[PDB]
Design an enzyme around this catalytic site. Structure first.
Site, PDB file in Angstrom:
ATOM      1  N   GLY A  15       0.818  -1.193   0.000  1.00 37.94           N
ATOM      2  CA  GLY A  15       0.000   0.000   0.000  1.00 37.94           C
ATOM      3  C   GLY A  15       0.856   1.248   0.000  1.00 37.94           C
ATOM      4  N   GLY A  17      -0.682   4.481   0.330  1.00 31.76           N
ATOM      5  CA  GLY A  17      -1.585   5.528   0.743  1.00 31.76           C
ATOM      6  C   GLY A  17      -0.901   6.449   1.718  1.00 31.76           C
ATOM      7  N   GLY A  18      -1.707   7.197   2.460  1.00 31.91           N
ATOM      8  CA  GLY A  18      -1.160   8.106   3.447  1.00 31.91           C
ATOM      9  C   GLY A  18      -0.548   7.429   4.648  1.00 31.91           C
ATOM     10  N   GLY A  20       0.765   3.899   4.382  1.00 26.63           N
ATOM     11  CA  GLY A  20       1.870   3.101   3.890  1.00 26.63           C
ATOM     12  C   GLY A  20       3.039   3.904   3.381  1.00 26.63           C
ATOM     13  CG  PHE A 120     -14.487  18.836  10.947  1.00 23.09           C
ATOM     14  CD1 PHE A 120     -14.774  19.814  10.011  1.00 23.09           C
ATOM     15  CD2 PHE A 120     -14.110  17.585  10.492  1.00 23.09           C
ATOM     16  CE1 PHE A 120     -14.661  19.552   8.655  1.00 23.09           C
ATOM     17  CE2 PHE A 120     -14.003  17.323   9.136  1.00 23.09           C
ATOM     18  CZ  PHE A 120     -14.278  18.307   8.219  1.00 23.09           C
ATOM     19  CD  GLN A 241     -18.498   7.670  10.339  1.00 28.28           C
ATOM     20  OE1 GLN A 241     -17.533   7.699   9.584  1.00 28.28           O
ATOM     21  NE2 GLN A 241     -18.653   8.529  11.334  1.00 28.28           N
ATOM     22  CG  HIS A 243     -20.580  11.437   5.111  1.00 26.95           C
ATOM     23  ND1 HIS A 243     -21.062  12.694   4.826  1.00 26.95           N
ATOM     24  CD2 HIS A 243     -19.348  11.616   5.639  1.00 26.95           C
ATOM     25  CE1 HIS A 243     -20.162  13.596   5.173  1.00 26.95           C
ATOM     26  NE2 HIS A 243     -19.112  12.967   5.666  1.00 26.95           N
ATOM     27  CG  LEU A 253     -18.132  13.206   1.246  1.00 30.02           C
ATOM     28  CD1 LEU A 253     -18.996  12.239   2.027  1.00 30.02           C
ATOM     29  CD2 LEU A 253     -16.764  13.369   1.878  1.00 30.02           C
ATOM     30  CB  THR A 255     -16.223  19.176   2.704  1.00 25.67           C
ATOM     31  OG1 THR A 255     -15.406  19.082   3.872  1.00 25.67           O
ATOM     32  CG2 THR A 255     -16.918  20.516   2.705  1.00 25.67           C
ATOM     33  CD  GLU A 256     -16.172  14.768   6.378  1.00 23.27           C
ATOM     34  OE1 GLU A 256     -15.938  15.153   5.214  1.00 23.27           O
ATOM     35  OE2 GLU A 256     -15.480  13.902   6.955  1.00 23.27           O
ATOM     36  NE  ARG A 287     -18.597  12.442   8.972  1.00 30.71           N
ATOM     37  CZ  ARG A 287     -17.389  12.116   9.409  1.00 30.71           C
ATOM     38  NH1 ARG A 287     -17.221  10.979  10.066  1.00 30.71           N
ATOM     39  NH2 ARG A 287     -16.357  12.919   9.201  1.00 30.71           N
ATOM     40  CG  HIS A 354     -17.572   8.862   4.813  1.00 31.78           C
ATOM     41  ND1 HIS A 354     -17.287   9.388   3.575  1.00 31.78           N
ATOM     42  CD2 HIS A 354     -16.763   9.499   5.691  1.00 31.78           C
ATOM     43  CE1 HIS A 354     -16.354  10.313   3.699  1.00 31.78           C
ATOM     44  NE2 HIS A 354     -16.020  10.401   4.973  1.00 31.78           N
ATOM     45  NE  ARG A 400     -14.174   8.782   9.903  1.00 34.06           N
ATOM     46  CZ  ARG A 400     -13.903   9.855   9.172  1.00 34.06           C
ATOM     47  NH1 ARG A 400     -12.710  10.417   9.252  1.00 34.06           N
ATOM     48  NH2 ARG A 400     -14.816  10.362   8.361  1.00 34.06           N
ATOM     49  CG  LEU A 406      -6.779  12.771   6.704  1.00 36.08           C
ATOM     50  CD1 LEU A 406      -6.822  14.166   6.140  1.00 36.08           C
ATOM     51  CD2 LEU A 406      -5.965  11.877   5.810  1.00 36.08           C
TER      52      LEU A 406
HETATM   53  C1  LIG Z   1     -13.249   8.501   0.704  1.00 32.51           C
HETATM   54  C2  LIG Z   1     -13.128   9.696   1.610  1.00 32.51           C
HETATM   55  C3  LIG Z   1     -12.451   9.544   2.787  1.00 32.51           C
HETATM   56  C4  LIG Z   1     -12.280  10.611   3.668  1.00 32.51           C
HETATM   57  C5  LIG Z   1     -12.820  11.863   3.323  1.00 32.51           C
HETATM   58  C6  LIG Z   1     -13.511  12.000   2.102  1.00 32.51           C
HETATM   59  C7  LIG Z   1     -13.676  10.935   1.246  1.00 32.51           C
HETATM   60  C8  LIG Z   1     -14.410  11.106  -0.058  1.00 32.51           C
HETATM   61  N1  LIG Z   1     -12.695  12.956   4.138  1.00 32.51           N
HETATM   62  C9  LIG Z   1     -12.047  12.791   5.261  1.00 32.51           C
HETATM   63  C10 LIG Z   1     -11.902  13.883   6.115  1.00 32.51           C
HETATM   64  O1  LIG Z   1     -12.362  14.980   5.849  1.00 32.51           O
HETATM   65  N2  LIG Z   1     -11.221  13.695   7.289  1.00 32.51           N
HETATM   66  C11 LIG Z   1     -10.701  12.497   7.630  1.00 32.51           C
HETATM   67  O2  LIG Z   1     -10.109  12.428   8.702  1.00 32.51           O
HETATM   68  N3  LIG Z   1     -10.817  11.420   6.844  1.00 32.51           N
HETATM   69  C12 LIG Z   1     -11.459  11.557   5.708  1.00 32.51           C
HETATM   70  N4  LIG Z   1     -11.603  10.477   4.874  1.00 32.51           N
HETATM   71  C13 LIG Z   1     -11.031   9.176   5.261  1.00 32.51           C
HETATM   72  C14 LIG Z   1      -9.574   9.055   4.885  1.00 32.51           C
HETATM   73  O3  LIG Z   1      -9.406   9.456   3.542  1.00 32.51           O
HETATM   74  C15 LIG Z   1      -9.075   7.617   5.024  1.00 32.51           C
HETATM   75  O4  LIG Z   1      -9.002   7.288   6.391  1.00 32.51           O
HETATM   76  C16 LIG Z   1      -7.700   7.412   4.396  1.00 32.51           C
HETATM   77  O5  LIG Z   1      -7.778   7.759   3.016  1.00 32.51           O
HETATM   78  C17 LIG Z   1      -7.200   5.992   4.515  1.00 32.51           C
HETATM   79  O6  LIG Z   1      -5.893   5.909   3.885  1.00 32.51           O
HETATM   80  P1  LIG Z   1      -5.129   4.508   3.846  1.00 32.51           P
HETATM   81  O7  LIG Z   1      -3.687   4.735   3.579  1.00 32.51           O
HETATM   82  O8  LIG Z   1      -5.524   3.745   5.059  1.00 32.51           O
HETATM   83  O9  LIG Z   1      -5.773   3.819   2.561  1.00 32.51           O
HETATM   84  P2  LIG Z   1      -5.811   4.302   1.042  1.00 32.51           P
HETATM   85  O10 LIG Z   1      -5.671   5.780   1.058  1.00 32.51           O
HETATM   86  O11 LIG Z   1      -7.002   3.709   0.378  1.00 32.51           O
HETATM   87  O12 LIG Z   1      -4.492   3.645   0.429  1.00 32.51           O
HETATM   88  C18 LIG Z   1      -4.497   2.239   0.092  1.00 32.51           C
HETATM   89  C19 LIG Z   1      -3.281   1.929  -0.742  1.00 32.51           C
HETATM   90  O13 LIG Z   1      -3.126   0.490  -0.836  1.00 32.51           O
HETATM   91  C20 LIG Z   1      -3.079   0.113  -2.189  1.00 32.51           C
HETATM   92  N5  LIG Z   1      -3.653  -1.205  -2.316  1.00 32.51           N
HETATM   93  C21 LIG Z   1      -4.952  -1.561  -2.102  1.00 32.51           C
HETATM   94  N6  LIG Z   1      -5.170  -2.834  -2.327  1.00 32.51           N
HETATM   95  C22 LIG Z   1      -3.941  -3.335  -2.728  1.00 32.51           C
HETATM   96  C23 LIG Z   1      -3.516  -4.617  -3.112  1.00 32.51           C
HETATM   97  N7  LIG Z   1      -4.316  -5.676  -3.153  1.00 32.51           N
HETATM   98  N8  LIG Z   1      -2.215  -4.765  -3.448  1.00 32.51           N
HETATM   99  C24 LIG Z   1      -1.416  -3.694  -3.402  1.00 32.51           C
HETATM  100  N9  LIG Z   1      -1.707  -2.444  -3.061  1.00 32.51           N
HETATM  101  C25 LIG Z   1      -3.001  -2.333  -2.729  1.00 32.51           C
HETATM  102  C26 LIG Z   1      -3.883   1.186  -2.904  1.00 32.51           C
HETATM  103  O14 LIG Z   1      -3.629   1.234  -4.289  1.00 32.51           O
HETATM  104  C27 LIG Z   1      -3.333   2.413  -2.194  1.00 32.51           C
HETATM  105  O15 LIG Z   1      -2.039   2.654  -2.721  1.00 32.51           O
END
Ligand SMILES: *Cc1cc2c(cc1C)nc1c(=O)[nH]c(=O)nc-1n2C[C@H](O)[C@H](O)[C@H](O)COP(=O)(O)OP(=O)(O)OC[C@H]1O[C@@H](n2cnc3c(N)ncnc32)[C@H](O)[C@@H]1O
Ligand SMILES: CCCCCCCC/C=C\CCCCCCCC(=O)OC[C@H](COP(=O)(O)OCCN)OC(=O)CCCCCCC/C=C/CCCCCCCC
Ligand SMILES: COC1=C(OC)C(=O)C(CC=C(C)C)=C(C)C1=O
Ligand code: SF4
Ligand code: F3S
Ligand code: FES
Lengths: 593, 237, 144, 131
Positions: A15, A17-18, A20, A120, A241, A243, A253, A255-256, A287, A354, A400, A406
């Site tokens: 992963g 993401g933020g 990993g 918030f 959850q 939303h 979505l 925003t909150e 929420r 959400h 949550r 974040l």
């Molecule tokens: C969807 C969302 C979430 C959100 C938000 C608004 C929206 C539309 N607003 C938020 C907010 O205002 N305040 C807040 O605190 N949180 C808010 N969120 C939630 C937040 O975005 C999530 O908690 C966060 O994005 C989670 O990040 P995390 O790092 O946990 O996950 P990810 O961002 O989805 O990254 C996943 C990575 O893993 C890779 N991946 C997935 N599956 C695989 C497999 N099988 N193999 C290899 N890599 C994989 C993904 O590609 C990505 O790189």
């Protein structure tokens, strides 16, 4: 049949993401050989679509104590959060956002050169008895966008070996412990066997099991299914959850912070939702209150909209200065998928899925968990950790708060990198294993590739998505939930005759969408059965036949096992942790109403 | 009563590489579809030919994966609306002058090696002593507006004629705006190193002001004015 | 040594497939916009005008080294035959518009390097003030 | 024109093998941008005061014009060499085509000497071809 390439690393991270990414240059800086395996490019994840903030008790708008920020996290969690992980995230919150700005995150600034903080919902000062406080510490409405683009740039400074666009199939196990992953390259079609000492899972949540969600298209459950296919449990899977605000039809979505600085829930009659049917005497609650307020409004007779399922959120009352400085990206994303502006007329609102507070059961320091089958006590898994949204540390519990997830990625993605450096010595020979390690994951790739059946993989994906929107929803009883476990089982027995029309291996984007479906049915069939075995109502899990919170019998998380698809799911329970790290720094709070 | 709009999607298959690339025709019902183009490409892959591959992640226009060439111009499919007129057909292509992988999937590998070479991280050498953040005024925060919100989709780079030929040496408009984003950051006191890898024959001075860059950016940014300020700062030194 | 024999074994399978990839079309599909047509005319006009400046100065420069003694009236009278009176106006007419679109284009390209008028409204309003200025000064040299 | 062997597919390596930039060579960098903006700031005034004057142009008012037109047409053709006959794809035939703007254009400065002395400038030749 295939050809398999072998790698050797100290730690691998699944992963980008933020969470990993923050765990990647935390170990590459300390002197390890990390490898961040990703499915997408790192600044294309789901954490680029966050328009919120990152909570911190910096105290630059007023006075602030961290321990006030702890109280709103545990009270808004219905006392199911582990208070030794609430104590660690909240105390290390001012230390970890000042360090986030030394990386080069452009924050909104104040009149003396300090970081700008707004309000918030859910967070108030003076121990829950006082006015609303400003702990959000945010860029305007690109807080998740400016978080990836800075954390990815700092991961280029230290040598982090990115393996971009790899699909991680399974985990490699050898007698109860893990030694690494087996991944599938999409660009040329080679299977890769990554051997590791510690593996870290940061693969995000699952939202695409439901019909309409605010998650991405690639936001399936891919680390929660890699764990349970190895025989390890998943924790608290029934708490999803809903939303209060999301675009009708598609699921985008707003925003909150739209209800943050001026926001009116407007029904068919046009009155602010403070009383007289649904809510309590405060606007902008959590929420689970304001999302159970909306779904019962359209059901009783107050039908706004076209098919009597709609809502309005007023924004014409605000000045036009707020609608360009504090939130410009919401002015554009409401005029495209809906086709209405944000200054004169209200935009459509529908409650959609959400966030997912279930995942790998994890200690406060990042190590994954399981239980011993005879004594019912905790026991770590050797060589496996987790962080992010694919990990249930129960810092959220059953509900949550806004902008607290974040902070989960930055703090608990940093604590993962500290409990490897205090546990492993850089560089140490790997064990000799058999030559057919990861052989059951090749034959499961070779079965779905040569598929010859009736139902296509986009026809079983619609039977799963509409079943979980009907039964497992905001209002559930034990007569639709008993049907929902019965309809999600009849779907999984039709995955054995799936049909696939693309027999290549270079960018088979039909083999991946049927491997993202096998991953999603395992996390869907445990959300249905473990929600039909919680006879209470707390957090985001409300039952119309048991509407009272039961703090004497049901102060426990669940643990769900399922080896493969069409396999029986069993449940076990573990007690919540209600004591903090140091009782002299702060006291543990007692459960109230 | 249905209304059918005919699509035309660029097709190649790397398992049989001897055949030339070609356009394939699909018939999309506009009544039971979505408004956008990605809602009509995902509808094809479910109810029709399912070997059509492309990139998509969020359906919103904030990630940057679905960048293709729809109707002549480079745009994102999540947002490009279908014109509701069944008589007119639509042509979809990959990003121009790129080595494609399978169907609509261009090899963006040289684009990620050039983004690493501009050093996209802060390079300060002194921090405050009390443990708080480094200061920055409000008027020096408005310098970054319009620069820090690029999503790295490369629709601006693969619209430049001078990037179509020299892309192994010339950095392109998407990368050079991300070098200007770090150049005028007021808390980035290492700026002579940045204006020395652009001072050669072909890194920045292959721009000629053919502004397709600013024209085709879907997020409304301006990578053509940002190149003209790196040249303006490399001279008066 | 693994991670080194694992990298050369990866480049062999990948470079074999990277040589069979095609190039997506770049011209003949792109939309004809005002930002590129009016900046491709600027280089075509200087190349055709600059070739004539070089062809007439080598012809007066090789006459000085290899002594032939060419004057202006020796070469002006030669150009005034060998072509029809319709064909002379085709050269006199096309070279006037290529001078007018380059004289205005070089004033357009001088405001642009001082970072002025580079937004999307300043590109499209000084492109209409260049097309209209071309037709005025282009016809003005056909009368004179 | 002989073509060198190119990179197999545009790239070489992994996405985390960064581009190695060439060294700082500001003679052909920032100093080349000056000579384009000097030769263009001294032609458009001198072509403005060559269409408002009815007769020919003076001797000293043409030798400044005939030299600033040479460098303005030389910097233009220098940009059409680097873009098209480049060193990645043609190699030593980038230098051989860059020497033909050398001793194939330095004898175009002796052609100016046959126009400022024995004739009336270059503005007298182009006004007498009757444009
Ligand atoms: C969807 C969302 C979430 C959100 C938000 C608004 C929206 C539309 N607003 C938020 C907010 O205002 N305040 C807040 O605190 N949180 C808010 N969120 C939630 C937040 O975005 C999530 O908690 C966060 O994005 C989670 O990040 P995390 O790092 O946990 O996950 P990810 O961002 O989805 O990254 C996943 C990575 O893993 C890779 N991946 C997935 N599956 C695989 C497999 N099988 N193999 C290899 N890599 C994989 C993904 O590609 C990505 O790189
Ligand atoms: C070596 C000489 C050969 C140069 C190349 C061959 C010809 C190409 C020259 C440029 C292309 C065509 C432009 C020529 C049009 C200008 C000449 C013209 O129009 O004739 C009339 C016109 C007015 O005549 P008057 O006696 O004053 O009054 C009118 C009669 N009562 O003559 C002029 O004085 C116009 C001034 C000349 C303008 C061009 C002079 C320099 C041209 C040489 C090549 C230019 C290269 C690059 C220049 C572009 C820089 C922005
Ligand atoms: C200066 O701008 C341009 C170029 O520069 C690289 C071109 O080569 C080309 C291709 C060649 C010509 C002369 C049209 C185009 C399209 C163009 O507009
Ligand atoms: S500048 Fe615009 S077009 Fe170019 S990559 Fe950034 S967002 Fe895309
Ligand atoms: S489109 Fe290209 S040529 Fe220059 S003005 Fe923009 S980088
Ligand atoms: S998927 Fe994010 S822009 Fe198309």
């Amino acid at each position: 049949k295939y050809h398999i390439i072998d790698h050797e690393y100290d730690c691998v991270v699944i992963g980008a993401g933020g969470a990993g990414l923050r765990a990647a240059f935390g170990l590459a800086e300390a002197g390890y050989k990390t490898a961040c395996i990703s499915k997408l490019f790192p600044t294309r994840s789901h954490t680029v679509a966050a328009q919120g903030g990152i909570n911190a008790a910096l105290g630059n708008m007023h006075k602030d104590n961290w321990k006030w920020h702890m109280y709103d996290t545990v009270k808004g969690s219905d006392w199911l959060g582990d208070q030794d992980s609430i104590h660690y995230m909240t105390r290390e919150a001012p230390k970890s956002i000042i360090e986030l700005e030394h990386y080069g995150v452009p924050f909104s600034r104040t009149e003396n050169g300090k970081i700008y903080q707004r309000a918030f919902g859910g967070q108030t000062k003076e121990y829950g008895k006082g006015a609303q406080a400003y702990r959000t510490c945010a860029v305007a409405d690109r807080t998740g966008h400016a978080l990836l683009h800075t954390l990815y740039g700092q991961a280029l400074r230290h040598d982090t070996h990115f393996f971009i666009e790899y699909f991680a199939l399974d985990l490699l196990t050898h007698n109860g412990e893990v030694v690494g992953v087996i991944a599938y390259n999409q660009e040329d079609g080679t299977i890769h066997r990554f051997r590791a000492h510690k593996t870290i899972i940061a693969t995000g949540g699952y939202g695409r099991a439901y019909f309409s969600c605010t998650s991405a298209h690639t936001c399936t459950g891919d680390g929660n299914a890699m764990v349970s296919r190895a025989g390890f449990p998943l924790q608290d899977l029934e708490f999803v959850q809903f939303h209060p605000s999301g675009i009708y039809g598609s699921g985008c979505l707003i925003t909150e912070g739209a209800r943050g600085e001026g926001g009116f829930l407007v029904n068919s009659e046009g009155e602010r939702f403070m009383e007289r049917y649904a809510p309590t005497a405060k606007d902008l609650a959590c929420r689970d209150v304001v999302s159970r307020a909306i779904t019962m409004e359209i059901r009783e007779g107050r039908g706004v909209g076209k098919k009597k399922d709609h809502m309005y959120l007023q924004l014409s009352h605000l000045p036009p200065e707020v609608l360009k400085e504090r939130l410009p990206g919401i002015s554009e994303t409401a005029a495209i998928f809906a086709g209405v502006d944000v200054t004169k007329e209200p935009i459509p609102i529908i409650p959609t899925v959400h966030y997912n507070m279930g995942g790998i059961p994890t200690k406060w320091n990042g190590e994954a968990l399981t239980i011993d089958e005879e004594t019912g006590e905790d026991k770590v898994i050797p060589g496996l950790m987790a962080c992010g949204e694919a990990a249930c540390v129960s810092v959220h519990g059953a509900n949550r708060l806004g902008a607290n997830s974040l902070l989960d990625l930055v703090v608990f993605g940093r604590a993962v990198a500290h409990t490897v450096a205090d546990t492993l010595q850089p560089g140490l020979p790997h064990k000799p294993l058999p030559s057919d390690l990861g052989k059951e994951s090749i034959a499961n790739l070779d079965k779905l590739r040569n598929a010859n059946g009736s139902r296509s993989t986009a026809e079983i994906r619609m039977n799963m998505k509409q079943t979980m929107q009907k039964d497992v929803s905001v209002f559930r009883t034990q007569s639709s939930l008993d049907e929902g476990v019965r309809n999600i089982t009849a779907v999984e027995k039709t995955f054995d005759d799936v049909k696939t029309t693309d027999r290549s291996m270079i960018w088979n984007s039909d083999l991946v969408e049927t491997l993202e479906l096998q991953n999603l049915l395992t996390c869907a069939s445990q959300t249905a059965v473990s929600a039909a075995n919680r006879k209470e109502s707390r957090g985001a899990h409300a039952r119309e036949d048991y509407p009272n919170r039961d703090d004497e019998h049901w102060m426990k998380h669940t643990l769900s096992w399922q080896k493969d698809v069409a396999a029986p799911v069993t449940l076990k329970y573990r007690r919540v942790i209600d004591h903090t790290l140091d009782e002299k720094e702060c006291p543990s709070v007692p459960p109230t109403v | 009563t249905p209304r059918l709009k005919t699509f035309k999607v660029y097709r190649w298959n790397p398992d049989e590489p001897s055949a030339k690339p070609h356009l394939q025709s699909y018939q999309v019902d506009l009544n039971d579809c979505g408004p956008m183009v990605l809602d009509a490409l995902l509808k094809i892959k479910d109810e029709q030919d399912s070997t059509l591959t492309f990139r998509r992640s969020c359906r919103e226009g904030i990630c940057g994966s679905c960048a293709m060439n729809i109707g002549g111009r480079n745009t994102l499919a999540c947002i490009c609306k279908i014109d509701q007129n069944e008589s007119k057909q639509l042509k979809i292509y990959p990003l121009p002058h790129m080595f494609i992988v399978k169907d609509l999937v261009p090899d963006l590998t040289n684009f990620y090696q050039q983004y690493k070479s501009i050093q996209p991280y802060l390079q300060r050498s002194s921090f405050p002593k009390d443990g708080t953040e480094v200061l920055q005024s409000i008027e020096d925060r408005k310098k970054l507006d319009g620069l820090y919100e690029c999503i790295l989709c490369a629709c601006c780079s693969t619209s430049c004629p001078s990037y179509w030929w020299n892309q192994e040496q010339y950095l392109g408009p998407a990368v050079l705006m991300q070098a200007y984003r770090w150049l005028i950051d007021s808390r980035d006191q290492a700026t002579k190193t940045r204006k020395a890898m652009l001072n050669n024959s072909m890194s920045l001075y292959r721009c000629h002001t053919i502004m397709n860059c600013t024209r085709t950016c879907p997020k409304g940014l301006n990578p053509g004015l940002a190149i003209a300020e790196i040249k303006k700062s490399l001279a008066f030194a | 040594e693994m991670n080194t024999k694992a990298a050369i074994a990866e480049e062999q399978i990948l470079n074999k497939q990277r040589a069979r990839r095609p190039i997506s079309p770049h011209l003949t599909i792109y939309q004809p916009q005002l930002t590129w047509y009016l900046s491709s005319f600027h280089r075509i006009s200087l190349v055709l005008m600059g070739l004539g400046f070089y062809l007439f100065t080598i012809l007066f420069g090789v006459s000085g080294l290899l002594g032939l003694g060419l004057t202006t009236e020796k070469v002006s009278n030669w150009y005034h035959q060998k072509f029809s009176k319709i064909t002379e106006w085709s050269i006199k007419g096309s070279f006037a518009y290529l001078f007018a679109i380059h004289y205005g284009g070089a004033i357009r390209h001088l405001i642009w390097d001082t970072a002025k008028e580079l937004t999307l409204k300043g590109v499209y309003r000084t492109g209409y003030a260049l097309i209209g200025f071309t037709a005025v000064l282009g016809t003005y040299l056909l009368t004179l | 024109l002989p073509v060198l062997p190119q990179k197999p597919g545009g790239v070489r390596g992994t996405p985390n093998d960064a581009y190695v930039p060439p060294p700082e060579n500001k003679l052909e960098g920032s100093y080349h941008w000056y000579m384009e903006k000097i030769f263009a700031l001294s032609v458009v005034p001198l072509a403005t005061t060559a269409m408002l004057t009815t007769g020919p142009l003076s001797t000293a008012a043409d030798s400044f014009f005939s030299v600033m037109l040479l460098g303005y047409c030389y910097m233009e053709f220098n940009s059409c060499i680097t873009d098209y006959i480049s060193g990645r794809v043609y190699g030593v035939w980038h230098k051989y085509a860059m020497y033909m703007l050398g001793l194939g254009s330095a004898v175009s400065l002796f052609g100016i000497y046959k126009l400022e002395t024995e004739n009336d400038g270059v503005v007298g030749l182009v006004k007498s071809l009757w444009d």
